[PDB]
């Protein structure tokens, strides 16, 4: 199936460098609430 463990967990979403995000930091570690 298209939805399967190895298939589902492959699709990791990350923030593409669109506009300001291209030059502003996005990854520093885990977020705090």
Partner 1 sequence: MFPEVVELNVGGQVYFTRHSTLISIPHSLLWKMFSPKANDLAKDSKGRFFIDRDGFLFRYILDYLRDRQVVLPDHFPEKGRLKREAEYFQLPDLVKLLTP
Q: How far is the CB of 5 from partner 1 (least distance, A)?
A: 9
| Min CB(10)–partner 1 separation in Å | 7
The residues binding partner 1 (CB under 8 A) are 2-3, 6, 8-21, 23-25, 27-33
Q: What is the total residue count of the chain? A: 33
CA distance 33 to 27: 16
- CB of residue 6 to partner 1, shortest distance in Å: 7
Residue whose pair of structure tokens reads 């979403």 in the numeric block: 13
Residue with tokens 């298209």: 2
């Amino acid at each position: 199936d298209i939805n399967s463990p190895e298939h589902i967990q492959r699709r990791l979403s990350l923030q593409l460098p669109i506009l300001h995000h291209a030059y502003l930091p996005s990854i520093g570690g885990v977020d705090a609430s």
